[PDB]
């Protein structure tokens, strides 16, 4: 569960858009958030809180462990060119100090109340999460 690179709530599945494709169960697609949301008939264990938290813990796939992390909100952020996207702007980010490598996208960010984010980009001791709360 903690290692899953997606968020699975009672009614929906949240994935990083570049890691999937639109399907007939897609209910939200936002490339400005690198986010795809699909409806699902099978209930999931995760909960997206309506809290205000910016601090918690996240899964790092490259290190294969969880890290504590403290984040700051950014309305928008410049993501550098990768392999799936050109250099572009993304919206609603949480940014914290922490390790991040290519391949870590989708790793969950949790506060006490539930999952609030997913790794979407990161670099030199910075990790960027899309805040899922605006989109739930
Ligand atoms: Zn919280």
From Swiss-Prot:
Zn(2+) 1 binds at residues 51, 53, 111, 113. This is Protease 2A. It comes from the Viruses. Cysteine protease that cleaves viral polyprotein and specific host proteins. It is responsible for the autocatalytic cleavage between the P1 and P2 regions, which is the first cleavage occurring in the polyprotein. Also cleaves the host translation initiation factor EIF4G1, in order to shut down the capped cellular mRNA translation. Inhibits the host nucleus-cytoplasm protein and RNA trafficking by cleaving host members of the nuclear pores. Counteracts stress granule formation probably by antagonizing its assembly or promoting its dissassembly. It catalyses: Selective cleavage of Tyr-|-Gly bond in the picornavirus polyprotein. Homodimer. The active site is at 18 (for protease 2a activity), 34 (for protease 2a activity), 105 (for protease 2a activity).
